[PDB]
């Protein structure tokens, strides 16, 4: 079963870990990652709120916007952290730790 991680491009940065497990990445987050997550969730909730003031469901639209926001933000943060764990992104503090 082709369950191997190799990329057509190459990890131009150091290669601290090739295929990190889930919990490792999601606990490897950085302050910038949480900021990205919070920003996405916030903008989503606000646009949901207004687009809900239009038809009178300010609440439920806020909840749905929140769901989409958490989904997108966590996916973006996990993507950034995974990149920094592999080499496809700048690694300074990850290399510091793994040293």
């Amino acid at each position: 079963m082709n369950t191997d991680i190799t990329a057509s491009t190459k990890p131009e940065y150091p290669v601290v870990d090739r295929n990190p497990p889930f919990t490792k990445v999601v606990g490897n987050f950085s302050t910038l990652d949480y900021l990205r997550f919070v920003t996405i969730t916030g903008v989503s909730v606000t646009v949901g709120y207004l687009s809900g003031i239009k038809p009178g469901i300010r609440g439920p639209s806020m909840v749905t916007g929140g769901l989409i926001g958490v989904m997108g933000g966590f996916m973006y943060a996990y993507q950034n952290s995974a990149g920094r764990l592999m080499g496809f992104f700048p690694n300074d503090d990850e290399v510091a730790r793994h040293n």
């Binding site: 900021l35 920003t39 709120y49």
Partner: peptide, 30 residues
């Protein structure tokens, strides 16, 4: 008579100020 009495709007305003603060912090980490 010294408060806002609309729950949904207050949640939305919390979300908006959180959004702006997060964007400012993100920029600070450029």
């Amino acid at each position: 008579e010294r408060v806002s009495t609309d729950k949904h709007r207050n949640y939305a305003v919390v979300a908006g100020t959180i959004t702006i603060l997060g964007a400012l912090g993100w920029y600070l980490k450029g």
